[PDB]
Structures are given as C-alpha cells and as structure tokens.
Write a protein that binds this ligand. Structure first.
Ligand code: H1I
Length: 144
C-alpha cells in the first residue's frame, strides 16, 4: 500500500515533532486514522510501554544494520500474532528507533526505519488488518 506508507510517515513525523527532534527527513478517514493512531501511540507510551521488555535494548541500531535484524526484533511483538494494540506498539517501536537515531546524530537512518516499517507492515500486518475490517475498525475501536 501507499496508504500505509503515509501512516508510518505521519506517525514518525508526529513523534519526532512531539519529542523535540527534526522531522524533516520527511519531505476524511485518513486524517482520522492518523489521529486515532497518534493518540493510541501516546496512550501506549503513557500507560503501558513501561511494562514491556525494551526491544530497543535488543537492536543497537547502526548504519550496518539490515531489514532482517529489524524484522527479527519486531517479530517479538507478534509471537502470539497480530492484534491492534501490538500494531500500536509496533508504531511506538519505530518512533523510538527514530528518536534514538536522531539522538545519536545518525539522522539519516530515520527514513530507512520508515522503509522497514512500511515493508513489515505491508508484508506481515496487513493480512490481519484487512481480515479485521481495516483501519476504519481501529478508529471505531480507538477514536478519542
Ligand atoms: C515486548 C513487547 N513490546 N516491547 C516493546 N518495547 C518497546 C519500546 C518502545 C516502543 C514500543 C515498545 S513495545 C510486546 C509483546 C507484545 C506486546 C503488546 C503490545 C501492545 C499490546 C499488547 S496486548 O494488547 O496484546 N496485551 C498483551 O499482550 C498483554 C496481555 C497479557 C494477558 C495475560 C493473561 C494470561 C492469562 C489470562 C489472562 C491474561 C501486547 O508488546
């Protein structure tokens, strides 16, 4: 999808803005999915992410690191399969890897992390999203 590409892009830009970094590595129901996912991600970071294993601990992200490394770590969010919260967490996770990377002046890694997210979302998560009524059902379940 291209739709999903802009979600990842929307999410990462919001998060970089929010946490105080440049988001300029990045140059209706869709504004509505964006919002719902934005807020979802904030609620997950606020209330919940504290409980989980730091998956950022299990991926010292560096210029050498490739998609399989990424994939293998995100796979830990989905050993029991996909659900909406785990998808929210997946976006959280990416945002996190963007904050660390800019915090590590590797600002260029960002767009690549966004590449990986769009690949991972599209290869593994999409089959579930569609089965479960797509993003419009997420919004209905997590709006406001
Ligand atoms: C380890 C991990 N995440 N780690 C992360 N690290 C970072 C760092 C930065 C940003 C995001 C993350 S996410 C992980 C695995 C699964 C999930 C997850 C994410 C979102 C939602 C959910 S959830 O909604 O599906 N909830 C759970 O999985 C917990 C439910 C536990 C029920 C246990 C139970 C047993 C028997 C009877 C009743 C209940 C899981 O996170």
């Amino acid at each position: 999808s291209q739709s999903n590409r802009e979600l990842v892009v929307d999410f990462l830009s919001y998060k970089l803005s929010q946490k105080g970094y440049s988001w300029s590595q990045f140059s209706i129901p869709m504004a509505a999915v964006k919002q719902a996912l934005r807020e979802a991600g904030d609620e997950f970071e606020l209330r919940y992410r504290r409980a989980f294993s730091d998956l950022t601990s299990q991926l010292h992200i560096t210029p050498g690191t490739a998609y399989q490394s990424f994939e293998q770590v995100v796979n830990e969010l989905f050993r029991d399969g996909v659900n909406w919260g785990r998808i929210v967490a997946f976006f959280s996770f990416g945002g996190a890897l963007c904050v660390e990377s800019v915090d590590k002046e590797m600002q260029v890694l960002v767009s690549r992390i966004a590449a990986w997210m769009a690949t991972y979302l599209n290869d593994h998560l999409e089959p579930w999203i569609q089965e479960n009524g797509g993003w419009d059902t997420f919004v209905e379940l997590y709006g406001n």
